[PDB]
Design an enzyme around this catalytic site. Structure first.
Site, PDB file in Angstrom:
ATOM      1  N   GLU A  11       0.804  -1.253  -0.018  1.00 27.10           N
ATOM      2  CA  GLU A  11      -0.032  -0.087  -0.113  1.00 27.10           C
ATOM      3  C   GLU A  11       0.743   1.246   0.063  1.00 27.10           C
ATOM      4  OE1 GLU A  11      -3.652  -1.719   0.516  1.00 27.10           O
ATOM      5  OE2 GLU A  11      -2.977   0.373  -0.297  1.00 27.10           O
ATOM      6  N   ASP A  20      -6.414   6.644  -4.571  1.00 28.01           N
ATOM      7  CA  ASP A  20      -6.006   5.351  -4.689  1.00 28.01           C
ATOM      8  C   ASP A  20      -5.986   5.093  -6.150  1.00 28.01           C
ATOM      9  OD1 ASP A  20      -8.652   3.202  -3.022  1.00 28.01           O
ATOM     10  OD2 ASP A  20      -8.614   4.424  -5.108  1.00 28.01           O
ATOM     11  N   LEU A  32      -8.575   3.967   3.276  1.00 30.72           N
ATOM     12  CA  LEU A  32      -9.830   4.584   2.402  1.00 30.72           C
ATOM     13  C   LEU A  32     -10.338   5.508   3.195  1.00 30.72           C
ATOM     14  CD1 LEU A  32     -11.423   5.068  -0.076  1.00 30.72           C
ATOM     15  CD2 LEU A  32     -12.753   3.141   1.094  1.00 30.72           C
TER      16      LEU A  32
END
EC number: 3.2.1.17
Length: 164
Positions: A11, A20, A32
């Site tokens: 990530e 993203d 998120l």
């Protein structure tokens, strides 16, 4: 290697709101914030999540703390989900990490939708499940990450990440 280092590789770590791969507002280690197009809605969710006025930026510490909550919640959800728990319990410790990684990326719901792949994993038909997992939007959209996770399921070692 562990879940935390695995996920930090897949990530990345970003201290300012960012979008993203799917275009959504995120911050930290893949946290998120919202699927809404409003940066404004994002800054607000961020403040609610950290508990201070961040002005869209957070510190390392704040990023890690959010990272720990998220890994925890991912594991907890797996353990509460009726379709995922049985698979998880059937797997070894390395493979548990690969399912947690899928969960963190796409949510409980999404993973749970991988019916046939889940069945194969439970049966321990590694090669077959790896081919089946590859046939998904997931693999076509984030192929390098998908391939790292897939090999992890396939071999049950951390080789895909020893590079990285």
């Amino acid at each position: 290697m562990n879940i935390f280092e695995m996920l930090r590789i897949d990530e990345g770590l970003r201290l300012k709101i960012y979008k993203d791969t799917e275009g959504y507002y995120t911050i930290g280690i893949g946290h998120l914030l919202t699927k809404s197009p409003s940066l404004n809605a994002a800054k607000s969710e961020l403040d609610k999540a950290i508990g201070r006025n961040c002005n869209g930026v957070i510190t390392k510490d704040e990023a890690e703390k959010l990272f720990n909550q998220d890994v925890d919640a991912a594991v907890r959800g797996i353990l509460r989900n009726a379709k995922l728990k049985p698979v998880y319990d059937s797997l070894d410790a390395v493979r548990h990490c690969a399912l947690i990684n899928m969960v963190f990326q796409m949510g409980e719901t999404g993973v749970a939708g991988f019916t046939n792949s889940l069945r194969m994993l439970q049966q321990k038909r590694w090669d077959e499940a790896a081919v089946n997992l590859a046939k998904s939007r997931w693999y076509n959209q984030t192929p390098n990450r998908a391939k790292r996770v897939i090999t992890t399921f396939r071999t049950g070692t951390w080789d895909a990440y020893k590079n990285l």
